[PDB]
Amino acid sequence: GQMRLPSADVYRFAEPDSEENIIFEEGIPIIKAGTVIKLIERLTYHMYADPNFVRTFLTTYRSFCKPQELLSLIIERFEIPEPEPTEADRIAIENGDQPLSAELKRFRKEYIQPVQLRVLNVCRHWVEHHFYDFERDAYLLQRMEEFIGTVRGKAMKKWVESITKIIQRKKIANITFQSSPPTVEWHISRPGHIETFDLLTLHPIEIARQLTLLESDLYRAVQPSELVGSVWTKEDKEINSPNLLKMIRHTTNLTLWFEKCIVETENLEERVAVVSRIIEILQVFQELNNFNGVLEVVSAMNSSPVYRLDHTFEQIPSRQKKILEEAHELSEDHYKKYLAKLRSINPPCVPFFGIYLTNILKTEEGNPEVLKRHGKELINFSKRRKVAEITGEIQQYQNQPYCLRVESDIKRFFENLNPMGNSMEKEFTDYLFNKSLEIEPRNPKPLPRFPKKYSYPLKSPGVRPSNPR
Amino acid sequence: GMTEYKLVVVGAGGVGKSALTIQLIQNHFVDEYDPTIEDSYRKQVVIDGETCLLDILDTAGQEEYSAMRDQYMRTGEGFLCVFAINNTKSFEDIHQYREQIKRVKDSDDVPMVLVGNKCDLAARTVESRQAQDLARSYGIPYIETSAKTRQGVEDAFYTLVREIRQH
Amino acid sequence: MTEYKLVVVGAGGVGKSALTIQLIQNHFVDEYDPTIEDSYRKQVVIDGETCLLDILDTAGQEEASAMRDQYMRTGEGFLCVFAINNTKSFEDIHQYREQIKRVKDSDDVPMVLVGNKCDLAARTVESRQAQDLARSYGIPYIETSAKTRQGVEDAFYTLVREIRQH
Ligand SMILES: Cc1cc(Cn2c(N3CCNCC3)nc3c(-c4c(C)n[nH]c4C)cc(Cl)cc32)cc(C)c1F
Ligand SMILES: Nc1nc2c(ncn2[C@@H]2O[C@H](COP(=O)(O)OP(=O)(O)NP(=O)(O)O)[C@@H](O)[C@H]2O)c(=O)[nH]1
Numbered sequence: 001g002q003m004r005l006p007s008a009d010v011y012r013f014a015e016p017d018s019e020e021n022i023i024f025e026e027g028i029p030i031i032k033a034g035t036v037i038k039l040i041e042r043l044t045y046h047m048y049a050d051p052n053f054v055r056t057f058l059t060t061y062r063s064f065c066k067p068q069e070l071l072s073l074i075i076e077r078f079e080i081p082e083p084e085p086t087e088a089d090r091i092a093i094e095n096g097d098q099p100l101s102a103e104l105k106r107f108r109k110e111y112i113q114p115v116q117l118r119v120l121n122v123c124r125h126w127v128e129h130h131f132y133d134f135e136r137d138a139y140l141l142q143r144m145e146e147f148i149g150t151v152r153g154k155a156m157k158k159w160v161e162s163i164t165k166i167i168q169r170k171k172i173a174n175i176t177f178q179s180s181p182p183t184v185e186w187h188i189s190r191p192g193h194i195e196t197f198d199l200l201t202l203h204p205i206e207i208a209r210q211l212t213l214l215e216s217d218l219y220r221a222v223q224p225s226e227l228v229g230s231v232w233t234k235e236d237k238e239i240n241s242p243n244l245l246k247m248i249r250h251t252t253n254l255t256l257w258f259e260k261c262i263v264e265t266e267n268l269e270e271r272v273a274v275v276s277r278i279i280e281i282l283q284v285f286q287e288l289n290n291f292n293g294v295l296e297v298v299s300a301m302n303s304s305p306v307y308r309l310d311h312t313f314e315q316i317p318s319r320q321k322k323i324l325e326e327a328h329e330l331s332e333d334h335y336k337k338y339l340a341k342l343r344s345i346n347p348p349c350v351p352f353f354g355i356y357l358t359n360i361l362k363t364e365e366g367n368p369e370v371l372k373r374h375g376k377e378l379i380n381f382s383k384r385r386k387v388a389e390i391t392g393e394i395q396q397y398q399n400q401p402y403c404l405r406v407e408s409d410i411k412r413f414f415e416n417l418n419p420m421g422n423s424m425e426k427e428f429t430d431y432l433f434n435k436s437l438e439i440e441p442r443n444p445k446p447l448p449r450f451p452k453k454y455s456y457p458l459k460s461p462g463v464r465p466s467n468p469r
Numbered sequence: 470g471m472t473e474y475k476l477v478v479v480g481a482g483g484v485g486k487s488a489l490t491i492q493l494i495q496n497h498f499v500d501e502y503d504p505t506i507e508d509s510y511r512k513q514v515v516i517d518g519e520t521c522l523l524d525i526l527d528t529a530g531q532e533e534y535s536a537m538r539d540q541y542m543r544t545g546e547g548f549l550c551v552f553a554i555n556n557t558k559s560f561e562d563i564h565q566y567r568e569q570i571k572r573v574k575d576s577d578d579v580p581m582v583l584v585g586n587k588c589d590l591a592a593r594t595v596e597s598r599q600a601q602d603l604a605r606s607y608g609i610p611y612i613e614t615s616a617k618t619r620q621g622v623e624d625a626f627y628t629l630v631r632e633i634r635q636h
Numbered sequence: 637m638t639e640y641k642l643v644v645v646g647a648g649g650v651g652k653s654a655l656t657i658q659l660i661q662n663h664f665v666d667e668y669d670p671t672i673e674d675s676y677r678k679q680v681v682i683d684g685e686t687c688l689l690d691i692l693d694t695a696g697q698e699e700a701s702a703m704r705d706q707y708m709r710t711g712e713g714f715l716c717v718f719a720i721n722n723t724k725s726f727e728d729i730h731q732y733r734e735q736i737k738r739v740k741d742s743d744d745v746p747m748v749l750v751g752n753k754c755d756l757a758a759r760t761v762e763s764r765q766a767q768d769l770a771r772s773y774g775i776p777y778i779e780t781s782a783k784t785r786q787g788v789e790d791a792f793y794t795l796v797r798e799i800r801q802h
């Protein structure tokens with residue numbers, strides 16, 4: 001038979017499942033809704049482990065339970081009463097013999113030890129992967145240190161001593177590859193001559209590589225704490241989502257820099273060379289699976305100032321028109337081809353973050369926090385699972401590093417790019433559009449001629465890499 | 470067969486804009502949503518006895534990608550310009566959204582509707598007369614909607630389709 | 637994208653977690669933090685086909701030995717890991733092999749035998765002894781180092797191929 005349980009009066013997590021406290025989706029069960037007590041019971045269940053559920057719960061629980069209350073509840077879960085001696089044990093003791101204690105030994109082995117170990121696994125994941133709760137609440141950290149540091153008894157001792165050390169390391173807080181990264185490529189600008197760095201003087205291969213390293217690092221830095229609760233859209237977004245906003249602002253700046261390079265090149269022949277170089281950079285972004293970079297270029301070529309430059313378009317080689325067309329097609333039909341390509345490539349890659357943001361926001365806004373059943377309010381956990389499926393996908397692409405060498409000067413050049421200068425956004429984007437009108441006026445105004453601005457060769461070195469010995 | 474209308478929702482973030490399309494496309498009567506589902510933004514409807522397909526682009530949450538607005542707007546035949554009736558800044562943003570749509574579409578007469586959205590019980594700061602006056606100054610309809618009761622939601626999208634049909 | 641459920645098993649301290657984190661993150665973990673149960677995901681192209689690996693990293697400490705049936709039921713293939721400088725961990729392999737067969741009620745479960753820590757000079761389990769055991773199980777034997785990456789992709793992706801041909 002099943003093990004008997006403590007009385008639900010002394011141990012709250014022994015209450016029977018009912019539709020008044022837990023609802024399952026239609027081989028472990030998947031929870032649709034439940035009380036916080038039932039969620040924590042199943043988070044630390046004696047019959048099976050559920051590592052996905054641990055991640056889902058620890059990513060999303062603050063929408064229904066405060067951190068201080070979660071810790072109180074898992075300490076309550078940990079403190080399981082042992083059953084009293086049975087009749088057979090009683091009779092043995094009355095005869096001066098040692099009891100077999102069969103039921104007690106089974107309850108320890110099959111209920112207490114698995115539940116307690118799974119409580120410690122929640123603590124371990126909490127500290128290792130969601131430590132911001134403790135960074136933001138020093139008293140919560142004190143309570144966790146005290147709880148772990150006072151767990152007695154040898155069955156848990158290895159994990160208790162380990163978790164104590166992990167906490168201490170987290171308070172005061174290297175890549176190996178299958179091959180060597182390729183050699184850094186140089187064009188007109190030579191190493192150390194940062195004052196000459198520009199769109200046409202750096203090598204287009206190396207522009208794409210260094211922007212991919214930068215954009216990969218920005219992508220990898222975004223934590224789920226910046227996303228859950230849609231906090232990057234709210235009034236405190238600069239406090240709660242700084243790495244996400246830094247990533248988006250880089251993308252915006254690069255798109256505007258591409259537009260500025262195009263429309264401030266007033267000579268038609270030179271502007272064709274500028275656009276051609278940008279499409280070559282896009283080609284290397286595609287080869288590197290840097291989809292953020294691909295869309296940075298596509299957004300610039302579809303912007304109002306650039307899109308209308310028909311005289312420039314007319315001189316772009318047919319093959320480059322095709323590269324841009326196939327990049328634009330990734331975004332069509334609500335990113336249908338992009339989503340399929342992302343799921344087919346071999347990482348490393350840099351995803352476009354915007355789709356994730358819209359899906360998290362709409363999942364939050366479009367589903368209720370609670371479900372009302374039999375007069376009770378149950379936490380709608382299915383909604384949180386959907387959010388954590390998105391944050392899980394984000395995290396999966398954050399693991400793989402690029403095998404590319406950093407060039408510190410080129411990196412700094414792109415980190416410090418500031419196309420808008422001190423201008424506000426409206427002022428600057430009006431300026432770009434007025435430049436577009438100046439260099440290619442609306443019909444029937446005649447097309448003017450403009451002097452060259454570049455004194456160095458415009459011929460591209462191409463985007464196939466070189467390899468000396 | 471039937472006509473497809475590509476509609477684009479634009480407006481300030483952080484103030485409940487996404488409720489407009491969610492409530493429309495939703496199982497009207499079951500309050501639930503998976504936006505990742507292929508065609509969670511396509512809806513066949515009958516407007517003035519004529520069946521059509523609405524394809525709605527709502528990039529809510531991507532407002533900080535400000536250099537992508539042209540890319541997204543270029544796809545649209547008609548636009549819902551949404552502000553929150555308890556957020557004056559979102560209302561003051563409308564002029565620039567409209568100017569940007571006119572520029573992307575290269576037209577002074579782009580089908581659009583002004584939508585004032587009630588996203589919570591916080592005090593209204595934009596009165597309906599202010600918004601009606603703004604809409605009239607632009608020559609476009611004004612619709613008010615509730616983010617919670619679905620009131621006005623059908624009217625906003627159907628009015629925009631009529632603006633496209635009568636362009 | 638086909639999904640594959642891989643499970644990494646073996647005695648405490650043999651390097652199950654270090655192997656998994658090297659595969660997932662290209663990083664070698666120097667600390668010895670005993671695992672309770674961890675899970676990882678990895679999208680990767682293997683033999684021209686994209687798949688999604690779900691990797692369960694299990695507890696080797698004996699105090700967790702009564703909690704294994706639940707993860708053995710879910711797994712589709714098993715990396716059976718010992719350390720080549722730890723003869724006791726090699727002797728523990730057959731206990732994992734027999735338990736997996738019982739739980740899945742099958743003589744034909746996808747498995748790979750992994751001899752880890754092959755960067756260390758002071759070997760105590762000879763390759764021949766491990767290879768003989770693997771042949772008796774009908775499975776390949778791959779020596780690995782979570783520290784240097786030697787053999788790591790080969791071990792995990794050979795297991796994927798086993799599941800695919802099962
Ligand atoms: C190559 C190029 C393109 C554009 C602006 N633009 C144009 N133009 C065609 C001509 N009339 C104006 C609009 N087509 C595109 C395409 C696209 C699609 C879809 N199918 N095939 C293509 C090529 C993709 C993108 Cl992202 C931008 C596009 C401006 C300049 C300066 C330029 F050099
Ligand atoms: N030299 C060397 N050390 C290794 C290798 N793999 C793991 N180690 C070291 O061995 C120790 C144990 O590694 P770990 O991955 O935690 O082992 P485990 O099998 O996961 N242990 P557990 O079963 O308790 O979770 C760590 O100090 C780790 O750095 C390897 O290939 N070479």
Ligand SMILES: [Mg+2]
Pocket residue numbers: 652653654669670671693694696
């Ligand atoms: Mg481990």
Ligand code: NA
Pocket residue numbers: 555556557558594
């Ligand atoms: Na206001």
